[PDB]
C-alpha cells in the first residue's frame, strides 16, 4: 500500500504555491504611509507565474537556476483624489521544485531538508528542589514571537517571566490585560490558590499594573500607563510580531480545552486564564491534568520547504514594506506609480540566501537512487530554530517510544550527528498540521478489516488504544491467530487476548526506513550492523553493468521509481524507435510518445547518471512496463552491487581484521568498475596590469605538450589527459614580449581520463559571468575505475572491508566443479558482530544461482513458522540440488558447507566451508596524500592543510605527548620547528638534505613570534630575557624579531 515515497517534499511546495504565498502576501497587503494619503493594496490572491526561462536541462547544463517570476496585481489608492493606478508589479524570482522533489540552484541539485522542531502550544513541567516540594511551571511557545513562562513558587505564588526578564506575579499581567477580579475569579476553578498570590502581592489595578509592567520590562524610564499598554500590545497582541500559528491554536485548544476560532492566532485573555487554571489544577492534582513530554512526537512538528520558504518570504516582505513606506512618505508629490513604488531586491535577496546559503537547503546526495531518495525523506533536529550540537544531549538523541512507525530506529549517522538526523519510516506521512502519522488496520472482534481503508493515526492518538504489530499472523479472511498478542498501550509493551486489540500495523517493515527495508534477513542481524549496512547502502557506486540481487527484499522496484531515473511506458502499445539517446512508443491506437535519455551526466558526488533503454525495436509493450533504466537499476528495481561467489574462511592473513581478499575476475570481467566524472574550472580575470588571455602561446613549453589543444588554448573533447597535462592554456600579464606568465589549468596529480565536455561561457555570449571575470571555461573529465587494493567493499548487512589482495584465479580456492571463488571473507568477523543474516543470503543466493531464480524475501518472515528463514533456505537448497543433479551442491550433514580445494597446491581444506552468492557493493571515494614542501598559512607560516592544495598532516598535541613519552627530543624538535614554521630553518634543512650535509640547529618558530606580538598588542609587556653572566650587570632583553 506504499504511497509516493517523496511526498513530504511535494505536498509542502504544492501547499506553498496554493495557499502559503497567498497568506503572506495578504497578511502585508494594505500598506499605508504615515500621513494616510496613499495606500498600496496587494491583491495577492491573483499572483500569476511566468513560465520558466531556459529549461530544467538548460539550467543544469548552463549552471543556472530553475525558477519563475512572480507578478502580483496591486492598486495604489490616493486617500483623497481617489486616483487608483492599477498595475502588476514584479515581486521576485521563485525557484521551482522539479518533478523529483528537488530544486536546481546555480546549476546544482539541492534539497530542502525537513526540520523536526518543538510544536507550538503550552507545556507543563514539574521540577523538584533539593529539599523542597514539587513546583510546576508552564511554558507557552508560539510559532513566532515571545514566550510566556508561568511558574509556581514553593509558597504557592504564581510568577510570570516575560522574555528572559525578572519575574512578576500573575496579578500584574492579568490586570494589565483588562480583566476585573470577578472574571479571573470565576474562570479559575480553585480561586483560593490564586487568592493567596493576590493577598501576598496586593491587588493591582489596571493603571498600576501597566505602570509596574513597564517598569519591570524597561527599567530606567518613567512608567506610563499608555507606555505599558503599548508594550503589551507589541509583545503578545501584535499580529505582525506574535503568531501562534494554526498548529499553535490547535494545540492550545486541544490542551487547555478552549473553543477559540482557528483564525485567531494571537494570545487572548481566555488563553492565559485557562493556562493558569491548568497550572493550579496540576498543582492541586485535580485529575485531568498532566505534565508534558517534549520528546513525544505528538508535541513535535515537521517543517518542510513550504514553511521555511513562507518565513523567508515574510522577512523579505517586511523589508520591502519598510522600503515602500520610506519611498512613499518622502515624496512630496503624488507622481508615484505602483511599479516605481515596490523594490523586489529584499525579497529576491531573502529567497536567494535561503536557497543558496542556508543550512536547511543542502547539496543533494546523489551517489545512487537510494541516497537520493533518503535525502528527501530526512528529518533534522538542527538548524535555524532547532538544536545545536553542543546543546543536544543524551535525551534528545534516543528512541522515544512515540517513534514507532514514524521515524526509523536504525538509519542514522555515526559520530557527532548520531541521533540528531533520522529517516522517515516506510508508511509514515506528515499531515497538514505537521505531525507524523502512520497507518493501521482496524480490528473488530479480533478480525483484521483489510476491506476498509487504512486508518492513519498520530503519536498522541495511538496512546489509549491497544495496537498490535504488523507481524501478527491472521488466518483465512482476517481473524488473528494465537492466544496472546503483543500490543502497545500508553507507550508500553504488553500482551493481550486477541479480542481486545484495537489496531494492527499494515506491514512488518512499517517501523524501519526505506534503506533499512532493503536488507533481507534483517531480523537475524544486530541493530548496529543493520545501521552500518543501511548507511553503507547509500554510499554504493553505480557500476558499469548493474545486476539485481538474487535475495532481494521486494522494495527494490519501488525504491527506484521515485528517483525519477527509470522510464516506464504509460501506454499499451508498440515500440517504434529505439536508440542510445531516444525511445519512441506508438500507442496501440493513438499518438506517439517520445523520451530522451540522459547519457553520461555527472552527479553532485561525481558518479555517473546514465540512462539506457531496455526494449528493442518493434516490441509489444504494456502500460507500466519498464522502458529505460538508471545507473543503479537493472530492470525496474534497484541494483547497487553484484552477486559473486563467496566463501567464509581465512586466507594466509589476507582476511585479517575485516580485510577482504578477492579474485582477479572482478577486475578483468569489469565487475565493480564505475564511471566517475570530475569538473575542472578556469577563470579569465582582469588584473590591474591587464587582462588574462586563453591562448596556446604558453611560455616555457614545447609543442610536444600542446598536441590536444583546439587552436584556442583549450583541450579537445575526446582527448586522453594524464597527470600534469594542460587542460586550458592561460597567460597572465605579470609585471617586472617576454612579460606573459603561465598559470594554465592542468590535471591534478593522480588524475587521468577522457575529456567529455568543454563548455565555455563569456559575457558576450549572454552568460552571467562573475563580477571580475571575462571567461569561464569548464571541463569535464570522465574515467573508469576498477576495483583495486585499498577500495572499500560492503554488504547489505553491515559487513564492510578493505580489499588487501587481488589473487590470480588459479590461486583462489575452487569448487568441486572447477569454479574458482570470487571473494574469501573471514568468518571471525561474523559471530562477534552478530550479522548472521549474511550467512542466510549467501546460501539463498547460492540456491538462486543454481535454480535460475530470484527470491523476494521480506524482513521478519518468521510470523509464518518457527524458523522460516532456515527452512526456506534448506528447502531451496535441496530443490536446487535435485534440479541440477549435482550432489555436491548441498550436503545433509553440513547444510551450508561444501568442499573447497586449494588453488595453490590442489589439496582440499580439512573441513568444508560456507560458500554462496553474496550481493556486495563498492563504496565511494582519492584519499592518498603526501607532501614534502608546499604552500603555507598567512599568519603562522605553517603548511596549509588539504589534499587539493598539497597540504600537510597535522601533528596534534596527542602526538606530541606520544613523542614526549618515548623520550624523543630530536624528532619532536625537528617536527615542531624545522618542518612546520621555522621560516629560515626550513630552507636550510632542505638545502642540507639536497646537498647532503647535516641539518643545522633550528631557531624560534614563527608562531611563537606571532603570539608574542599579539600579546604585546593586548597591552602586555611580555618579553624574552637573557640573564646577566657577571654580578653587576642587568639582564638584557633579547630581540627575537631580528
Amino acid at each position: 500500500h506504499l504511497p509516493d515515497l517523496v511526498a513530504i517534499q511535494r505536498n509542502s511546495f504544492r501547499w506553498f504555491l496554493e495557499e502559503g504565498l497567498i497568506e503572506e502576501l495578504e497578511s502585508f497587503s494594505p500598506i499605508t504611509d504615515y500621513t494616510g494619503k496613499l495606500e498600496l493594496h496587494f491583491l495577492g490572491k491573483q499572483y500569476k507565474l511566468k513560465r520558466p526561462k531556459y529549461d530544467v536541462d538548460e539550467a543544469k547544463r548552463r549552471d543556472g537556476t530553475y525558477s519563475v517570476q512572480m507578478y502580483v496585481p496591486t492598486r495604489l489608492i490616493n486617500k483623497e483624489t481617489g486616483e487608483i493606478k492599477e498595475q502588476e508589479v514584479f515581486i521576485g524570482d521563485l525557484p521551482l521544485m522539479t518533478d523529483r522533489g528537488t530544486f536546481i540552484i546555480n546549476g546544482a541539485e539541492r534539497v530542502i531538508v525537513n526540520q523536526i522542531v518543538r510544536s507550538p502550544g503550552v507545556y507543563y513541567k514539574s521540577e523538584r528542589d533539593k529539599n523542597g516540594r514539587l513546583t510546576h511551571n508552564a511554558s507557552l511557545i508560539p510559532n513566532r514571537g515571545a514566550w510566556l513562562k508561568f511558574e509556581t513558587d514553593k509558597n504557592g505564588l504564581v510568577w510570570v517571566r516575560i522574555d528572559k526578564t525578572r519575574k512578576l506575579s500573575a496579578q500584574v499581567l492579568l490586570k494589565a490585560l483588562g480583566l476585573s477580579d470577578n472574571e479571573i475569579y470565576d474562570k479559575l476553578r480553585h480561586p483560593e490558590y490564586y487568592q493567596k498570590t493576590i493577598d501576598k502581592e496586593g491587588q493591582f489595578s489596571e493603571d498600576e499594573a501597566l505602570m509596574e509592567l513597564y517598569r519591570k520590562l524597561r527599567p530606567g524610564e518613567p512608567p506610563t500607563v499608555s507606555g505599558g499598554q503599548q508594550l503589551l500590545e507589541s509583545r503578545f497582541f501584535d499580529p505582525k510580531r506574535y503568531d501562534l500559528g494554526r498548529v499553535g491554536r490547535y494545540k492550545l485548544n486541544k490542551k487547555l480545552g478552549l473553543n477559540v476560532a482557528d483564525t485567531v492566532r494571537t494570545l487572548t485573555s481566555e488563553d492565559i486564564l485557562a493556562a493558569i487554571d491548568y497550572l493550579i489544577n496540576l498543582e492541586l492534582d485535580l485529575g485531568g491534568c498532566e505534565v508534558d513530554d517534549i520528546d513525544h512526537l505528538g508535541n513535535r512538528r515537521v517543517r518542510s520547504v513550504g514553511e521555511l520558504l513562507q518565513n523567508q518570504v515574510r522577512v523579505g516582505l517586511n523589508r520591502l514594506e519598510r522600503i515602500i513606506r520610506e519611498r512613499m512618505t518622502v515624496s512630496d508629490s503624488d507622481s508615484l506609480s505602483p511599479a516605481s513604488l515596490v523594490n523586489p531586491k529584499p525579497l529576491v535577496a531573502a529567497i536567494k540566501e535561503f536557497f543558496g546559503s542556508s543550512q536547511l537547503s543542502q547539496f543533494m546526495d546523489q551517489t545512487n537512487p537510494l541516497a537520493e531518495l533518503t535525502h528527501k525523506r530526512r528529518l533534522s533536529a538542527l538548524g535555524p530554530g532547532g538544536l545545536t550540537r553542543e546543546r543536544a544531549g543524551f535525551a534528545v538523541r534516543d528512541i522515544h517510544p512515540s517513534h514507532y512507525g514514524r521515524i526509523c530506529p536504525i538509519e542514522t549517522p555515526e559520530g557527532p550527528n548520531a541521533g540528531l538526523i533520522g529517516s522517515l519510516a516506510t508508511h509514515a506521512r506528515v499531515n497538514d498540521y505537521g505531525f507524523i502519522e502512520t497507518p493501521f488496520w482496524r480490528v473488530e472482534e479480533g478480525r483484521v478489516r483489510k476491506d476498509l481503508a487504512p486508518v492513519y493515526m498520530t503519536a498522541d492518538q495511538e496512546d489509549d488504544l491497544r495496537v498490535a504489530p504488523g507481524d501478527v499472523a491472521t488466518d483465512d479472511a482476517g481473524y488473528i491467530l494465537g492466544t496472546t498478542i503483543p500490543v502497545r498501550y500508553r507507550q508500553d509493551f504488553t500482551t493481550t487476548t486477541p479480542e481486545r486489540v484495537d489496531y494492527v500495523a499494515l506491514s512488518p517493515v512499517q517501523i524501519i526506513s526505506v534503506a533499512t527495508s532493503l536488507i533481507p534477513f534483517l531480523e537475524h542481524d544486530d541493530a548496529n550492523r543493520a545501521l552500518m549496512g543501511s548507511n553503507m547502502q547509500r554510499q554504493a557506486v553505480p557500476l558499469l553493468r548493474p545486476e539485481r540481487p538474487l535475495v532481494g527484499t521486494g522494495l527494490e522496484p519501488q525504491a527506484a521509481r521515485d528517483s525519477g531515473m527509470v522510464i516506464t511506458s504509460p501506454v499499451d502499445g508498440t515500440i517504434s524507435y529505439v536508440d542510445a539517446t531516444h525511445i519512441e512508443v506508438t500507442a496501440d491506437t493513438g499518438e506517439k510518445y517520445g523520451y530522451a535519455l540522459q547519457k553520461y551526466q555527472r552527479s553532485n558526488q561525481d558518479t555517473c547518471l546514465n540512462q539506457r533503454p531496455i526494449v528493442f525495436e518493434g516490441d509489444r509493450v504494456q502500460r507500466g512496463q519498464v522502458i529505460a533504466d538508471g545507473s543503479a537499476t537493472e530492470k525496474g528495481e534497484l541494483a547497487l552491487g553484484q552477486n559473486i561467489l563467496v566463501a567464509y574462511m581465512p586466507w594466509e592473513g589476507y582476511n585479517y581484521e575485516d580485510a577482504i581478499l578477492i579474485s582477479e575476475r572482478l577486475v578483468y570481467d569489469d565487475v565493480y568498475t564505475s564511471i566517475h566524472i570530475e569538473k575542472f574550472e578556469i577563470e579569465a580575470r582582469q588584473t590591474k596590469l591587464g587582462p588574462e588571455e586563453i591562448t596556446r602561446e604558453i611560455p616555457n613549453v614545447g609543442e610536444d605538450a600542446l598536441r590536444q589543444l583546439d587552436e584556442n588554448g583549450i583541450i579537445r573533447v575526446g582527448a586522453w589527459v594524464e597527470s600534469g597535462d594542460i587542460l586550458v592554456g592561460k597567460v597572465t600579464p605579470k609585471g617586472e614580449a617576454r612579460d606573459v606568465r603561465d598559470n594554465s589549468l592542468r590535471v591534478p596529480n593522480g588524475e587521468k581520463g577522457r575529456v567529455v565536455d568543454v563548455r565555455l561561457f563569456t559575457r558576450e555570449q549572454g552568460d552571467e559571468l562573475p563580477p571580475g571575470a571575462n571567461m569561464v571555461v569548464r571541463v569535464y573529465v570522465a574515467q573508469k575505475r576498477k576495483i583495486q587494493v585499498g577500495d572499500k567493499m560492503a554488504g547489505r548487512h553491515g559487513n564492510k572491508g578493505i580489499i588487501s589482495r587481488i589473487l590470480p584465479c588459479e590461486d583462489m580456492p575452487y569448487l568441486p566443479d572447477g569454479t574458482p571463488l570470487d571473494i574469501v571473507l573471514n568468518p571471525l568477523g561474523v559471530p562477534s558482530r552478530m550479522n548472521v543474516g549474511q550467512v542466510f543470503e549467501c546460501m539463498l543466493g547460492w540456491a538462486g544461482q543454481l535454480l535460475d531464480a530470484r527470491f523476494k524475501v521480506t524482513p521478519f518472515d518468521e510470523m509464518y513458522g518457527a524458523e522460516a528463514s532456515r527452512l526456506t533456505v534448506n528447502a531451496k537448497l535441496s530443490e536446487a540440488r535435485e534440479q541440477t543433479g549435482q550432489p555436491w551442491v548441498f550436503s545433509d550433514d553440513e547444510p551450508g558447507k561444501i568442499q573447497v580445494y586449494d588453488g595453490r597446491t590442489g589439496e582440499p581444506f580439512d573441513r568444508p566451508v560456507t560458500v554462496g552468492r553474496a550481493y556486495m557493493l563498492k563504496l565511494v571515494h582519492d584519499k592518498i596524500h603526501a607532501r614534502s614542501t608546499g604552500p603555507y598559512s598567512l599568519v603562522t607560516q605553517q603548511p596549509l592543510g588539504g589534499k587539493a592544495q598539497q597540504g600537510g598532516q597535522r601533528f596534534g598535541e596527542m602526538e606530541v605527548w606520544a613523542l614526549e613519552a618515548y623520550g624523543a627530543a630530536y624528532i619532536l624538535q625537528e617536527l615542531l620547528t624545522v618542518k612546520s614554521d621555522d621560516m629560515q630553518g626550513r630552507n636550510e634543512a632542505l638545502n642540507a638534505i639536497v646537498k647532503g650535509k647535516a641539518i643545522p640547529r633550528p631557531g624560534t618558530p614563527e608562531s611563537f613570534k606571532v603570539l608574542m606580538r599579539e600579546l604585546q598588542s593586548l597591552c602586555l609587556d611580555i618579553a624574552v630575557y637573557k640573564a646577566s653572566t657577571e654580578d653587576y650587570e642587568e639582564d638584557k632583553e633579547v630581540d627575537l624579531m631580528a
Partner: protein
C-alpha cells in the same frame, strides 16, 4: 542600572525639553553675536600671530572684561542649548540609515556634527523653522559619513554617485526595454567604455571576512613568498655561473660582474668602471665583448642553456 548604551543615550536625550520657535529665534540672535565676536578674535589672532588674551579681546571690543566674558558665556550656552535640544531630531533622522555600513550610534554622532554646523549657519531673519534647515545639514553629514566610513576599502563620494547613477540607468532601461539590459547597452547609455563599467562593478564589491565558513576561509589561502624549493634553484644557479666565470680571465670576469651587478645588484655603466678600473671608457666595452665571445662558445658554458 541598564547595560545598554543606546538606551542610556536616549534617556540622556530625553532629559532635555524641546525648544519653541521664539526660543529658537532668541538663541539664534545670541549665536550670531557669538559668531561675530569669534570672527573678531580670529582677526586678532591674525594680527598677533598668537591667541589674543581675554583682556586684549575685550579691548578689541571696547568692552569691560566682565561684560565681554559674560556675553561670550551667554553665546556659548545658547549654541549649546540649540544643539542639545535638537539631538532628538538628529536621532529621528539617523534612524533611517541603520543598515548601510555605520552602526546606529555612529550615525547619531556623525549627524550631531551636521546639527552643530546647522546651528552655526541658521538665520532667524529668514523666517523659517530650525527643524527645516537643520535637516539638510544632518542628512548631509550622515550621508558623507557613510560615504567615508562604511567600507574597509573606502570609495570616493563620486564613485558612490556613479554607482547610484548606473543602478538608476539600468532600472530605467529594464523598464523601457522590458528585459535585463546588456553590458554594452548600459555602457552606451552611460556614454562610458565597458571596461570602466566592469572596473566600477569590481570596485563596488564588499571585502569578505577571513573567517567565513567554507572551517574558515583564512585557512585555505596560501602565503606570498618564495617556495623553499624555488630558493634552491637560486643558490645552485649562481654557482654554475661563477664556475663558467672562473674560466674567463680575471679582468674579464670582474668586468662582467660589475657590468651586470652580480655583487651589488646594481648594473654599472662603462664610466664607473672607466674611473674605478685602470683604463677608461671604450676599453671596458672591448673587454665585455671579448669575454662574452668566450662564453658564447659551446664549451665552458652549456648547462645554463637549460635555465632559459
Amino acid at each position: 542600572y541598564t547595560e545598554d548604551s543606546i538606551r542610556l543615550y536616549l534617556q540622556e536625550i530625553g532629559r532635555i525639553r524641546l525648544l519653541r520657535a521664539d526660543e529658537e529665534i532668541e538663541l539664534a540672535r545670541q549665536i550670531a553675536d557669538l559668531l561675530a565676536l569669534e570672527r573678531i578674535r580670529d582677526e586678532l589672532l591674525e594680527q598677533l600671530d598668537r591667541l589674543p588674551s581675554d583682556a586684549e579681546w575685550a579691548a578689541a571690543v571696547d568692552s569691560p572684561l566682565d561684560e565681554f566674558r559674560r556675553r561670550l558665556f551667554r553665546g556659548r550656552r545658547a549654541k549649546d542649548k540649540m544643539v542639545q535640544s535638537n539631538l532628538r531630531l538628529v536621532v529621528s533622522i539617523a534612524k533611517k540609515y541603520m543598515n548601510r555600513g555605520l552602526s546606529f550610534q555612529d550615525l547619531i554622532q556623525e549627524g550631531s556634527l551636521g546639527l552643530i554646523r546647522a546651528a552655526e549657519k541658521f538665520d532667524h531673519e529668514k523666517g523659517y523653522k530650525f527643524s527645516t534647515y537643520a535637516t539638510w545639514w544632518i542628512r548631509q553629514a550622515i550621508t558623507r559619513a557613510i560615504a567615508d566610513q562604511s567600507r574597509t576599502i573606502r570609495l570616493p563620494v563620486h564613485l558612490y554617485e556613479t554607482i547610484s547613477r548606473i543602478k538608476k540607468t539600468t532600472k530605467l532601461l529594464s523598464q523601457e526595454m522590458g528585459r535585463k539590459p546588456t553590458e554594452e547597452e548600459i555602457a552606451t547609455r552611460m556614454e562610458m567604455t565597458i571596461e570602466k563599467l566592469r572596473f566600477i562593478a569590481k570596485s563596488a564589491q564588499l571585502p569578505i571576512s577571513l573567517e567565513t565558513p567554507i572551517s574558515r576561509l583564512g585557512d585555505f589561502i596560501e602565503a606570498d613568498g618564495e617556495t623553499p624549493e624555488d630558493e634552491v634553484a637560486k643558490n645552485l644557479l649562481r654557482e654554475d655561473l661563477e664556475g663558467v666565470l672562473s674560466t674567463l680571465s680575471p679582468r674579464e670576469r670582474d668586468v662582467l660582474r660589475l657590468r651586470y651587478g652580480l655583487d651589488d645588484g646594481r648594473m654599472k655603466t662603462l664610466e664607473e668602471i672607466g674611473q674605478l678600473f685602470n683604463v677608461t671608457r671604450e676599453r671596458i666595452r672591448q673587454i665585455e665583448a671579448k669575454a662574452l665571445r668566450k662564453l658564447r662558445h659551446p664549451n665552458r658554458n652549456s648547462i645554463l642553456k637549460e635555465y632559459i
